[PDB]
Symmetry: D3
Amino acid sequence: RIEALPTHIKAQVLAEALPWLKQLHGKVVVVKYGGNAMTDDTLRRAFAADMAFLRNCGIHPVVVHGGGPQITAMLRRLGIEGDFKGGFRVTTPEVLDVARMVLFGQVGRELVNLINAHGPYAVGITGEDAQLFTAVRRSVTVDGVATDIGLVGDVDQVNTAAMLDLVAAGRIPVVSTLAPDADGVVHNINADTAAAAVAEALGAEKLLMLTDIDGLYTRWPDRDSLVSEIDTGTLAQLLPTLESGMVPKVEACLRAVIGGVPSAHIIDGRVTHCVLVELFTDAGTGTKVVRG
Amino acid sequence: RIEALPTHIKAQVLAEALPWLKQLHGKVVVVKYGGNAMTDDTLRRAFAADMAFLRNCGIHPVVVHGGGPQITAMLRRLGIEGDFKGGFRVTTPEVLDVARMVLFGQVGRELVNLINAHGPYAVGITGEDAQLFTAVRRSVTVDGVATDIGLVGDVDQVNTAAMLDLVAAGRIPVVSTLAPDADGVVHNINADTAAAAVAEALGAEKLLMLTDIDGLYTRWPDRDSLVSEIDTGTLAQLLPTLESGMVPKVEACLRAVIGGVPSAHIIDGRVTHCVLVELFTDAGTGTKVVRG
Amino acid sequence: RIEALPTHIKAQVLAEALPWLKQLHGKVVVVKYGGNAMTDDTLRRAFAADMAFLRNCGIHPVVVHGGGPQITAMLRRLGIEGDFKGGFRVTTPEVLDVARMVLFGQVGRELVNLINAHGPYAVGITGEDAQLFTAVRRSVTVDGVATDIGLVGDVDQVNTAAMLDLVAAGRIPVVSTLAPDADGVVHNINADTAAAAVAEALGAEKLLMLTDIDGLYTRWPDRDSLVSEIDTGTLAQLLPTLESGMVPKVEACLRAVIGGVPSAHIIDGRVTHCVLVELFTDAGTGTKVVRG
Amino acid sequence: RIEALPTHIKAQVLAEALPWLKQLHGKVVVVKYGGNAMTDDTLRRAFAADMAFLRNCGIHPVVVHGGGPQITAMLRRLGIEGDFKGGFRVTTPEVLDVARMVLFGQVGRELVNLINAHGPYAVGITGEDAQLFTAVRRSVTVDGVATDIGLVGDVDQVNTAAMLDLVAAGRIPVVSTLAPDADGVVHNINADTAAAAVAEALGAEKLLMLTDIDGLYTRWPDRDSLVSEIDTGTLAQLLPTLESGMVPKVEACLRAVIGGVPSAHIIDGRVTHCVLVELFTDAGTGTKVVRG
Amino acid sequence: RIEALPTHIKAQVLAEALPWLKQLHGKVVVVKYGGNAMTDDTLRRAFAADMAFLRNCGIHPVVVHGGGPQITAMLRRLGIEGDFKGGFRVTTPEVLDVARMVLFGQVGRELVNLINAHGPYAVGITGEDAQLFTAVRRSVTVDGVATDIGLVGDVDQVNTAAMLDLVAAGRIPVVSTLAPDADGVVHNINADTAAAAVAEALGAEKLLMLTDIDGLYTRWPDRDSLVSEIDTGTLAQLLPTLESGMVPKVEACLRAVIGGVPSAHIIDGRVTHCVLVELFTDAGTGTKVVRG
Amino acid sequence: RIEALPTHIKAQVLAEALPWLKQLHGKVVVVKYGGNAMTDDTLRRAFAADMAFLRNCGIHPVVVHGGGPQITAMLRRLGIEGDFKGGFRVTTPEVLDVARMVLFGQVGRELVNLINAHGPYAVGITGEDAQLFTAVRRSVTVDGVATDIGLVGDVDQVNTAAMLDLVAAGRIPVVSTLAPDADGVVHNINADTAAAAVAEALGAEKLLMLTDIDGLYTRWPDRDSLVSEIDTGTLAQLLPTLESGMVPKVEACLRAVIGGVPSAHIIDGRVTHCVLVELFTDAGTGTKVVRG
Ligand SMILES: N=C(N)NOCC[C@H](N)C(=O)O
Ligand SMILES: N=C(N)NOCC[C@H](N)C(=O)O
Ligand SMILES: N=C(N)NOCC[C@H](N)C(=O)O
Ligand SMILES: N=C(N)NOCC[C@H](N)C(=O)O
Ligand SMILES: N=C(N)NOCC[C@H](N)C(=O)O
Ligand SMILES: N=C(N)NOCC[C@H](N)C(=O)O
């Protein structure tokens, strides 16, 4: 029902992209890709087409993906019983091997192949490859005490130079968030915190975080709570109040934007081509976070 | 009235651009710019924004402009009485100096400045600069006899290499169609034939020719005559029948597409952002000419 | 017991490497890595140190790995019952996903990490990444009739240029042999045939094929059958007689050396640092195949 | 009468050029070109040959030209009556358009074509092209009060990098002194002040200012007043005493040499090949200004 | 007595250099340097200044030097008695060592140091260094029988690429004519034949051969015999008639010009700055040889 | 008797080279070459093969050579009687010419030719060529008074950049230690002090100094005095006690290692392939000097 669209309306949608093309040309955009945007075929195919879009505009997308539920599925099919502290599964060496094998050997593969239907762009990588980035073991807090939950950590250091060589070669890196610690022992890294760490280290112009909601509600569930733009100051003050589902997506945006990334975006991964809408439209389809 | 546009319609307009972004990324597009698209301020400002659009997509636009009516105006303000053979003004050395001074020193200037509101892109050039291209004197036919009408000719040879150096540097060349002959004497070149010559020599992916009409009508004025796509074979057979206004715009498309340019486009310069519409929409806003 | 080695013997071992350093400097060496050389920790750690050796000589190693037994293990742990035609497991879409996930997400990972203890060298890749190479479905012969056994094939075409860009950047590619067909459907490729295909396409100076035996015996099990050098002519004539374990390793050497690779080597992966011995010693530790 | 020149005299003239070739090789020389050196055909043809000379020595000439009298002529032929404050014509938007069209579209054109008889060297440019330099509106002083005289100003900022890219490509820039202000409105810039501004910004080794006199007389009209070398200190003290014709040519030399340009030269544009004489002869044909 | 030279005469000498600067810019000139031009201090210092001149014009000089008499002197001071067949000294391994040590270690050194007073330009080389060129043993004819006279030969092959790398780096190669044969045994090469061989292999624009005479006399000693220009056809026919001193200098010019070198020049090394005179003056100071 | 070497011993010798290959890959090694390592043919041929070894590992060797005894021999064959102050021969301009001619024109030549049997690597150079380094006249102390002994000095400044261009081009520089002072007058430089000066200026990873002894004895002639590793602190304190033969070799190591060179090595030039042994074996064959 878009043949029926008069040509002067198509003209104005295209033209409205100009200031965003100009702000992003030759710049890197880190895209955290997860949620339904990763399970419905229409949404995924469109997300892949959009990484190609950016690349065919001379924009440099970097995709960081998660895959928590597919790990648990494979761990269940292998009969690997988990140990849990608080709400956390302990990542034994056995669980890491499965997580790595699932993230890198299955979930990364499907994205690379989708993107590569448009051309020779996607390349899968972890922190292990060429020592592109390292991890540092992180503990969590259960009942306000810090606790070890196995081979889990945060991005420690990033080989910024070698990373930017990959995208100057015209490649879209699909990053599975696994990385060696300083002793060579590979950890699993939360894909949200990692996308923010990669955004900051690569000097990204934008960090996009796909989620399964319209945007951020300041006082959920009040419908009026929805905000389209917000700065780090007010947002950090709202943080110890939001739903548990958005605390990590917000902490990532805070860390990124304060880390120098001009804007981070919490966008609706249920919207087809949500990437194109947030980047090339003034209104967008999510919450834009800036510093202030 | 485009805030009112639902976000999923904006999504589909943007997404439909993908296969054209991919076909044009890193490619040169020669755009012949004339007609009303050059006299109404809204249209011109939009045409300038569109050259910047292409450039901010990693596309390489080259603008060839005419300016026949502004020359006649200046010739009238200078009281330079013309001599006419057939319907042709003889281009004396005096008329060339005015034509060059008007084309290069006024009409080219306004475009360069418009485009350059978006950034350091436009550079004005003639065939004289760096010997970028030469001319060869052409005669016309009045009553079926070939006749001399002064310092007028066709593009003879083009410095393809130096031309492509200019656009690899990220510059949009605004070409005033004046060029030296083999003896150094500068001629004026019809901007339509020149755009086709520059398209062919630069290996352009598309030649766009802005005119003041919807597209080509095969049996004007029959409304049903309008065609959106047509090949060189059928088109060359329609040529000794169309209106006098479109014979040059068609001959250029023939010469270009047969010269290897994959497609030439006769598009409506009265449509705002007509460049964006023909390039990034499947339907377009003109007639597409291919070989066949 | 090598402190006890007199310094003039260490001198002569080192010096004897000179003509091989000279023949290989700046050249690519494809190394097919499998067998025990991939299951005993001492052998694997030494194999990793040797890829670093080559790289620290300005030699360009490319590692192609298999992993048949680890796939069958994982298929067993997942309870995926196989279908068999002849001695062949049918590779359903389900088996491919496991094979890819095991080859790329586990077996490739361990090598990359081993090599990367020496520095930022190893990068895992499949034919899917950047469309580095494609596959073409192959059938097998059961009882002399050609038979379909699922998503299995041969290397079809190789992106030679992009491959050599990777190693000019100083990277050691660890190749998991999975590749998309012309329709995008990923197949599993026998690592032996693939190493020979990659050798030929990259213009490799040598193809090394690690196996679990001293070398090739012409009339096994006669101890006198062992040959240290042999040409394609005599070897192709010996082929329909050897043990079933060596027919693929020999066919690969034939295809490579006839494909222009100056020499292919069937070397003993049970010998620690077997790579260093075959490359930098005149005698070697395997069978050298040349054309003749 | 130069066949009659003995070969050992030709030898010594050539040899005396050596220390100046060495001081200028690979260096930029800004040449302000005006006066009779621009109206007599022998002088102009020789000036063009000399820009080619420099370029065929690996020297990088940059030509800044004026053209005040040709503007007034065209303004008279168009019947554009001027408004005058003091001795200054007000530069209305109409006068700017004529000035730009004359400077860029006629006077620049003739030089480019002359130079280009020797090869593909000359390219005409203004501050508008690629935003190569901007202007800032300047007022003048009539009777010691500062007064607005329209769209006239000084060079504000220069795109040093893009300028030096042009001459590293082997091109001789012919600069028409028109430039946009910070709002995009194009002004006309006095060619003398502009040549000094371009000299300083490009790190020029020398600024040559062609005039219609032997050199600078310190107490004109005393014949003994002529000086061949002088420093900024003494010269700035002589400035509020010289003829009105030389105050701008001197202020330019002061601004340049104090701006870091090692020497500025006021040379006689009535001398054929005056450029060659001042640059490659110890004596020169003008006044050399240094710092002190 | 050149202060007394009016400035308009200095102008015309300089200007007359233009077409030769243009023909030689970026081109290599092989200069065979010998005779008195190598023994009188004024002449040598001027010859060195002239190599710097060429280099400071973006011209690429290559100097090939001889030194026959200084070898005989050193052989006499060492008491090495010679053996002679015909008029030829047999070049024993002992004589080669002296010749190499004199040519490379003394005569080359003085030139390099002279040239390098003007800057970091000269570098001494033989065919031994980087295998820049090889030799092939040549026999001579005594009484019409070909005879061995030791380690003497002709330039066999030249590393054109590595040679042109040296001059693109901005270096003036001072070539001592010694080169290894295919077995590594170094021979001495006649500097005249070698300069012609280096001219041909480097694609030189000109070969200059300094001698101790005005130019070539066709029927010496007739004063009218002197010719300023001559082609290979007529010259080869004059060859079995000239003085013994010029047969090698002519054979070199023939071999070079027929080898594709546009012109070879036999110029008077007794004229100060003879290089500058022949290159940058229309008349020259020698005989110019062209093909015809 | 090295065929008899079991393959697993050859394996371990090769493998033990890995950490040294890694520490030296892409790094420059200055090698001072003198003593018997320069007079016995087996040792010299092996030393040449070893420079090729380094180069075929992507290591950048730079050879500094002496040749004191061959100078005295030639001075004797020429009957040039010397003048002596203390134990020092005065270097008259005559002696310099012989020294330069011997060092550069004979001793350098033989090494270049030896090395070049392995490929196009060696190039002979002095400080005179391209002004690669200068000298400063040095006086010596006879009976504790500083005394002039002619044209002798120390390396003053080094053209680090142009030097490293030579080795990035893949060339092994054979350096004859002669260099011009600031006035252009060439001096002879002690090859030991020069190797240390070149090591420091090029940022060398190691300086190797070949001598005619096992290593450094701290209290010669006590056999127990031999040390395999020692730091600058203890070594400088041992210096005013060692044999006269090693004071210069030690002072060079001190100056180098304190100059930032990570380690200097005094190795036994009587050991065949002593370079390979000290570099690629943990034990070495000399004394390693580090800072401490
Ligand atoms: N307000 C929100 N959440 N989005 O609108 C901003 C989108 C704009 N294209 C940008 O990239 O900044
Ligand atoms: N049918 C016409 N006239 N235009 O539609 C084709 C437009 C398409 N973007 C192209 O560039 O080919
Ligand atoms: N004969 C056998 N199988 N090996 O010896 C040859 C090894 C040699 N380094 C080579 O790389 O050719
Ligand atoms: N004295 C005067 N005015 N000129 O002589 C100096 C000219 C010299 N070639 C230079 O470029 O400095
Ligand atoms: N006629 C003789 N011998 N010389 O005059 C020619 C010189 C000219 N510069 C050239 O380089 O060709
Ligand atoms: N101890 C001595 N003298 N040598 O052993 C050290 C050698 C080691 N390859 C190095 O290059 O440091």
